[PDB]
Amino acid sequence: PGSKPFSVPVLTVEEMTNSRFPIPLEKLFTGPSSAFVVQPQNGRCTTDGVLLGTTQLSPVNICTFRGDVTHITGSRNYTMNLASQNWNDYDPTEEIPAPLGTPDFVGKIQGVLTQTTRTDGSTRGHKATVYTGSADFAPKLGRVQFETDTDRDFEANQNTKFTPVGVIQDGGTTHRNEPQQWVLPSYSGRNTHNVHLAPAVAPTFPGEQLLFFRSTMPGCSGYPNMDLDCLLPQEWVQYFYQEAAPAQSDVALLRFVNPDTGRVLFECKLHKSGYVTVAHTGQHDLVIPPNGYFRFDSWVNQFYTLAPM
Amino acid sequence: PGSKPFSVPVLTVEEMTNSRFPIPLEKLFTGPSSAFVVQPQNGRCTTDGVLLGTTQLSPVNICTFRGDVTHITGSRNYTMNLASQNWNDYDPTEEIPAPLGTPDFVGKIQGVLTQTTRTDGSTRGHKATVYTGSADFAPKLGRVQFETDTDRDFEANQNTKFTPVGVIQDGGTTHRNEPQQWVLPSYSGRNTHNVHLAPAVAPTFPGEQLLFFRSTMPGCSGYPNMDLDCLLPQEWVQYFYQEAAPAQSDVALLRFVNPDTGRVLFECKLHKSGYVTVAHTGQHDLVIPPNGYFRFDSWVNQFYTLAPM
Ligand SMILES: C[C@@H]1O[C@@H](O)[C@@H](O)[C@H](O)[C@@H]1O
Numbered sequence: 001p002g003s004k005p006f007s008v009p010v011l012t013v014e015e016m017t018n019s020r021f022p023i024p025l026e027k028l029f030t031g032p033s034s035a036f037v038v039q040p041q042n043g044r045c046t047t048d049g050v051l052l053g054t055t056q057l058s059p060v061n062i063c064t065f066r067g068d069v070t071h072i073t074g075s076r077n078y079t080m081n082l083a084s085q086n087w088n089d090y091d092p093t094e095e096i097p098a099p100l101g102t103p104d105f106v107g108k109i110q111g112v113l114t115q116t117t118r119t120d121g122s123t124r125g126h127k128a129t130v131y132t133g134s135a136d137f138a139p140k141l142g143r144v145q146f147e148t149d150t151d152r153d154f155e156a157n158q159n160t161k162f163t164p165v166g167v168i169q170d171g172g173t174t175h176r177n178e179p180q181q182w183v184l185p186s187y188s189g190r191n192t193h194n195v196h197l198a199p200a201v202a203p204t205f206p207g208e209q210l211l212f213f214r215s216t217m218p219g220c221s222g223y224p225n226m227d228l229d230c231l232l233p234q235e236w237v238q239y240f241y242q243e244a245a246p247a248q249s250d251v252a253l254l255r256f257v258n259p260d261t262g263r264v265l266f267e268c269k270l271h272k273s274g275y276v277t278v279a280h281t282g283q284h285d286l287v288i289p290p291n292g293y294f295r296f297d298s299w300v301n302q303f304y305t306l307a308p309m
Numbered sequence: 310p311g312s313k314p315f316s317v318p319v320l321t322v323e324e325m326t327n328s329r330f331p332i333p334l335e336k337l338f339t340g341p342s343s344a345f346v347v348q349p350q351n352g353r354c355t356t357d358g359v360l361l362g363t364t365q366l367s368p369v370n371i372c373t374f375r376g377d378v379t380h381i382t383g384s385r386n387y388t389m390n391l392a393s394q395n396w397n398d399y400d401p402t403e404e405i406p407a408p409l410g411t412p413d414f415v416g417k418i419q420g421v422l423t424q425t426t427r428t429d430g431s432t433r434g435h436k437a438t439v440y441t442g443s444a445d446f447a448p449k450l451g452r453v454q455f456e457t458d459t460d461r462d463f464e465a466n467q468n469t470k471f472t473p474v475g476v477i478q479d480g481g482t483t484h485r486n487e488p489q490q491w492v493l494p495s496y497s498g499r500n501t502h503n504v505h506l507a508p509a510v511a512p513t514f515p516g517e518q519l520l521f522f523r524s525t526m527p528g529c530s531g532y533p534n535m536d537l538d539c540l541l542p543q544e545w546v547q548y549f550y551q552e553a554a555p556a557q558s559d560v561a562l563l564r565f566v567n568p569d570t571g572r573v574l575f576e577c578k579l580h581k582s583g584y585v586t587v588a589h590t591g592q593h594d595l596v597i598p599p600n601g602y603f604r605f606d607s608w609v610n611q612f613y614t615l616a617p618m
């Protein structure tokens with residue numbers, strides 16, 4: 001009784017960041033999810049500040065890789081032997097699904113591989129793409145592969161970084177049928193079982209749906225599905241981690257307030273395991289004031305009935 | 310008296326992010342600064358949460374640009390007519406030096422320009438470089454130029470984004486003599502005066518130097534100077550903005566604690582206007598435990614004498 005008061009930050013949606021790719025939030029979206037399994041590994045955190053899945057604290061690290069590269073002779077492809085984010089040796093023994101910040105969806109992520117030669121400080125950067133559905137995508141084992149636009153420029157045994165930019169669609173896939181944001185990679189490679197996963201989430205209360213914090217990933221080629229939905233803004237992960245306020249019930253009731261009118265636009269349930277639901281049936285792009293923000297009002301139970309969104 | 314207690318977050322250096330480029334912090338550095346003018350515009354915030362210069366809240370937006378592009382015929386160069394970060398019209402009337410997150414140093418920043426065609430969702434991405442020392446670099450006026458590897462692929466009148474990756478050195482400049490991290494761009498173009506700047510900072514107390522929060526920018530070509538020093542971690546900007554705790558004096562005394570020993574490694578002054586000094590003379594790479602963190606201990610005056618670092 002009387003535990004440290006819980007709260008959410010006073011930040012607008014546009015002031016916040018996707019927790020699944022290093023891009024700002026744009027909008028709120030709700031829709032049915034019974035046709036897929038919603039089990040992202042980034043953007044996972046309890047309200048009392050326990051990080052889950054592959055979630056870490058800074059959004060700039062999400063979908064980045066570091067290590068050194070080995071040329072696949074006769075190609076423009078390179079295997080990256082992963083390092084830790086601080087350039088130390090990779091330690092695969094942590095009880096996590098994959099290094100923190102590893103991509104948590106199947107898709108073709110395009111970005112840039114950069115490298116510095118230690119002896120002289122010479123540098124180089126080239127377009128690179130990682131296919132996280134590849135049989136050889138095995139970040140938990142410390143290896144991933146990049147397709148690049150060079151077969152000779154990258155040196156072995158030198159620090160190399162991948163900075164993500166966006167996603168592509170190619171290879172005869174159907175328009176907007178990739179990336180597949182709700183398909184988890186096999187983190188140890190094809191036909192291995194993922195471990196230490198944050199659980200799947202779903203609305204369980206009749207008439208409820210998940211509320212998604214949505215961005216549009218940049219597209220780099222083809223006709224990709226650029227929608228990217230996270231369960232928590234990165235800033236909420238950061239805030240809960242720092243506050244570590246105890247949950248007094250299973251559900252924190254939040255009101256989304258419009259400062260231009262002083263009135264509540266909608267209310268929602270922030271589940272203590274770290275996801276949000278609203279009372280709505282159907283796909284809906286929420287129309288919000290850009291200065292709107294969420295406000296924690298009370299601890300309720302999972303069987304509280306929300307006002308329709 | 311009795312004002313809301315000030316604090317800094319319990320985050321390690323490696324858990325934090327540079328406030329001047331979207332990359333993690335790596336280390337702490339101190340050195341003399343009397344030979345340059347230290348006046349960065351990103352990573353500027355008072356301890357009571359007032360954002361300064363071009364500082365905004367999410368690190369992923371730093372050094373990004375959005376808008377639409379106009380091809381310079383007979384070249385592979387494009388002028389970007391800037392939009393707001395949320396894709397609304399750019400409003401140059403705000404009393405800021407340039408759009409929030411604009412680069413605050415002179416250098417050649419390489420990244421990727423991406424574009425989506427609205428009608429069909431077709432996408433494209435190409436290597437692009439902005440030279441923030443260019444006479445035509447005029448983000449405050451809503452204009453910047455990109456050199457790319459195409460003269461035909463980018464459409465006019467479509468949403469286009471620049472995602473930064475790193476820096477280059479070329480054009481016969483001396484090795485490691487660019488970027489110039491302490492040279493501010495002319496935000497309205499060559500021979501215009503910058504406005505609404507966060508002030509220059511310097512140590513004033515004898516025997517003190519600035520403490521810098523340092524990263525290494527990726528290099529994309531040539532022999533760039535990749536050192537990037539910020540005055541405050543991005544997470545401290547975020548935290549002070551959210552806490553808005555009043556400063557009880559000009560200086561917050563912080564101790565850097567080593568949890569592996571329980572002892573203080575060094576102490577430093579966090580000035581209320583948002584920068585840090587230490588008692589040291591000379592260039593020094595601080596050797597810190599990776600789990601070390603800063604802790605606010607007391608309000609002191611600017612005339613307090615620190616223990617030597
Ligand atoms: C769908 C197509 O994808 C890539 O080939 C782009 O280079 C084209 O401009 C177009 O967007």
Ligand SMILES: C[C@@H]1O[C@@H](O)[C@@H](O)[C@H](O)[C@@H]1O
Binds near residue numbers: 122124125153529531
């Ligand atoms: C200094 C040089 O810079 C660019 O030309 C790179 O492509 C080279 O590999 C080398 O790093």
